Curated annotation (Swiss-Prot):
Coiled-coil boundaries: none
Record protein name field: COP9 signalosome complex subunit 4
Subunit and interaction comment: Component of the CSN complex, composed of COPS1/GPS1, COPS2, COPS3, COPS4, COPS5, COPS6, COPS7 (COPS7A or COPS7B), COPS8 and COPS9 isoform 1. In the complex, it probably interacts directly with COPS1, COPS2, COPS3, COPS5, COPS6, COPS7 (COPS7A or COPS7B) and COPS8. Interacts with TOR1A; the interaction is direct and associates TOR1A and SNAPIN with the CSN complex. Interacts with STON2; controls STON2 neddylation levels. Interacts with ERCC6.
N6-acetyllysine modification, residue list: 25
Residues of the full protein shown: 1 to 133 of 406
Disulfide pairings: none
Function of the protein: Component of the COP9 signalosome complex (CSN), a complex involved in various cellular and developmental processes. The CSN complex is an essential regulator of the ubiquitin (Ubl) conjugation pathway by mediating the deneddylation of the cullin subunits of SCF-type E3 ligase complexes, leading to decrease the Ubl ligase activity of SCF-type complexes such as SCF, CSA or DDB2. Also involved in the deneddylation of non-cullin subunits such as STON2.
N-acetylalanine carried by residues: 2
Domain of life, per lineage: Eukaryota
């Protein structure tokens, strides 16, 4: 069902309702993305992340749901968590000045999946990228 995710996210990109009307609808598609299974889940989340970083989707919507997105990936296995995390860190890279609270929390969960699987190199290199000071 990875064809009604790009459909529903597209129409809400330009609406005429308040933040409660739109942020409530967008988080309902996060349900449609996470509930998928196999290799069909893997592309529906990529549709969700590109819509948030989009310039046609407001900044009040982008910092609200990428917070909820970052805590829905500790649920999934280490094969899908690491796949989707690296997708979220190079679509937020074009505008890394805006979502630094997301870039901080996303890169921390990524370094834990690395170290777990005997990766003592790339876990560190991701924490270097976190713009602390």
């Amino acid at each position: 069902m990875a064809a009604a995710v790009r459909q529903d996210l597209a129409q809400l990109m330009n609406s005429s309702g308040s933040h409660k009307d739109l942020a409530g609808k967008y988080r309902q598609i996060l349900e449609k993305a996470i509930q998928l299974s196999g290799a069909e889940q893997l592309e529906a989340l990529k549709a969700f992340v590109e819509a948030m970083v989009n310039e046609n989707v407001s900044l009040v919507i982008s910092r609200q749901l990428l917070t909820d997105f970052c805590t829905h990936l500790p649920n999934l296995p280490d094969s899908t968590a690491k796949e989707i995390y690296h997708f979220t860190l190079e679509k937020i890279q074009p505008r890394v000045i805006s979502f630094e609270e997301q870039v901080a929390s996303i890169r921390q969960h990524l370094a834990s999946i690395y170290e777990k699987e005997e990766d003592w190199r790339n876990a560190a290199q991701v924490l270097v990228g976190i713009p602390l000071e």
